[PDB]
Chains A and B, each alone.
Chain A
Amino acid sequence: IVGGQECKDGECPWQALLINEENEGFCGGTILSEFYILTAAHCLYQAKRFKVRVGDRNTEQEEGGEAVHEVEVVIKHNRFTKETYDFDIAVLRLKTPITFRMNVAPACLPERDWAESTLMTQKTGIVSGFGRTHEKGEQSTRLKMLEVPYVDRNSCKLSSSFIITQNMFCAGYDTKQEDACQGDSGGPHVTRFKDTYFVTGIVSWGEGCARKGKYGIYTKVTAFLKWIDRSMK
C-alpha cells in the first residue's frame, strides 16, 4: 500500500496474508468465515505451496494472536486466465477453522442488487495489505489500509493499456500517490455502510503503483456473489 495509514488495532480484522514456503507474504486474502478465505486466482501461480496467516498486524512482532492455517482446498474460478486477468477470484477452504478474536473476524458479503445501488455508489472503499510502500519499494512489516475513491468505468477504460471487463472495477487516484501495490493482490477491498464493512472487491492488478493517469484494478465482487456462495456451499 502506497500512502494511506497503518491499520489501527482491530480495524482490519478480516485481513489475511498468504505465506511462501520461506514464510514470506506475497498475497492477501479476506476472511469470509471460520473455514473460508477469499483471494485472487492469479495469486495461485506465484507460489507452489503456501499457507494463510491471520490476526497479525506486525510480521516482525509476535503479538500473541497469530495463527497459521493450512489450506484444505483451492477453488479457482475456472474462467480465470493470466492472459486476461478476468474472473480474478478464488476461494480457499482451511483445514482447521479460524477462531474469531481480537484482530480476527470476517467481512460481510452483501446482497447483490443492494451492493450495486448502495455500496458501489459510495464515494470510497478501503483496501488494506502488507504490500510494498512504493512501486520499486519493499513490503511493509505493518498492516496498512487506504481509502480509495470509486473511479467511473469510462475513465477506467480510457486510462488503461489493458482491457477492463465487467468483472473489474477501478479505484484510487489519477495523480495522487496512493494506491495498492505489489503484495496486496488478493487482499480486501471493503465498503463501509453504517459502521458495517462489506466485501466489494479483490485487489487484482495495476500498471505499477500510484502512477499518474493510472488507477488500481479490482475484481468486482458483486459479479461473483452467487459463485462465492456455491464455492462455500
Chain B
Amino acid sequence: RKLCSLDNGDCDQFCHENSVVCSCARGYTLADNGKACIPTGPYPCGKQTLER
C-alpha cells in the first residue's frame, strides 16, 4: 500500500507506483533492501564533495 506520496515510498531517490518501485540515478546502485541508493564511485552525481 506504500505510496510515493508518503516519504517518497521510503526510496532514497526515484519512486514509482500497484506497489512502489525505487530506483536511482546513473552512478548509483539500488541496495538489496530496494530503497537505498549506493554510489559506485567517489564522485557520484549530486553529492557535494566534502571528504577527500
Q: Which residues on the A side are within 8 Å of B33 (C-beta)?
A: none
Within 8 A of A (CB), among B1-52: 4-5, 8, 12-16, 23, 25-27, 37, 42-50, 52
From B16, B26, B47, B52, contact of A114 by CB (8 A): B16
- Residues of chain B within 8 A (CB-CB) of A107 are 45-46
In angstroms, Cα B7 to Cα A199, docked, is 21
Q: Give complex CA distance A100, B43 in Å.
A: 6
For B4, the chain A residues whose CB sits under 8 A away are 114, 117-118
Bound together, the chains give a CA A101 to CA B47 distance in angstroms of 12
**Given the contacts A110-B25, A113-B16, A118-B15, A105 and B8 also touching, CB distance less than 8 Å:** no
B25 contacts A109, CB within 8 Å? yes
Interface check A75, CB cutoff 8 A: no
**Alpha-carbon separation in the docked complex, A198 to B43 (Å):** 14
Which DSSP category, helix, strand, loop or mixed, fits chain B's interface? Answer: loop
- Number of interchain pairs (Cβ within 8 Å): 71
Interface size on A, residues (CB 8 A): 28
Is the Cβ of A111 less than 8 Å from the Cβ of B48?
no
State in angstroms the CA–CA spacing of A32 and B46 once bound together: 10
A window 95-120: CB within 8 A of B: 100-111, 113-114, 117-118
Question: Complex Cα distance A79/B49, Å?
Answer: 36
In the bound complex, what is the Cα–Cα distance between A118 and B5 (angstroms)?
A: 9
Q: How far is the CB of A117 from chain B (nearest CB, A)?
A: 7
Q: What 0/1 readout, one digit per residue, does chain A (175-198) give for beta carbons within 8 Å of chain B?
A: 000000000000000100111111
When the two chains form their complex, are residues A108 and B14 in contact, meaning their CB atoms are under 8 A apart? no
Assuming the A-B contacts A109-B25, A118-B8, are A104 and B49 also in contact, with contact meaning beta carbons closer than 8 angstroms in the complex?
yes
- B52 surroundings in chain A (CB, below 8 A): 102
Q: Which residues of A contact B49 (CB under 8 A)?
A: 10, 13, 101-105
Shortest Cβ distance from residue A199 to the other chain B in the assembled complex, whole angstroms: 8
- How far is B4's CA from A13's CA once the two chains are assembled, in angstroms? 29
Task: Please give, as numbers and ranges, the residues of chain A lying within 8 Å of B46 by CB-CB distance.
Answer: 14, 106-108, 190, 196-198
Asked if A24 is an interface residue, CB under 8 A from chain B, the answer is no
Complex CA–CA separation, A24 to B22 (angstroms): 43
> Can you report 8 A-B residue pairs in the complex whose CB atoms are below 8 A from each other?
A100-B42, A106-B46, A108-B26, A110-B25, A111-B23, A118-B4, A194-B8, A196-B45
Binding site for B on A (CB under 8 A): 10-11, 13-14, 33, 100-111, 113-114, 117-118, 190, 193-198
Contact residues of B with A, CB < 8 Å?
4-5, 8, 12-16, 23, 25-27, 37, 42-50, 52
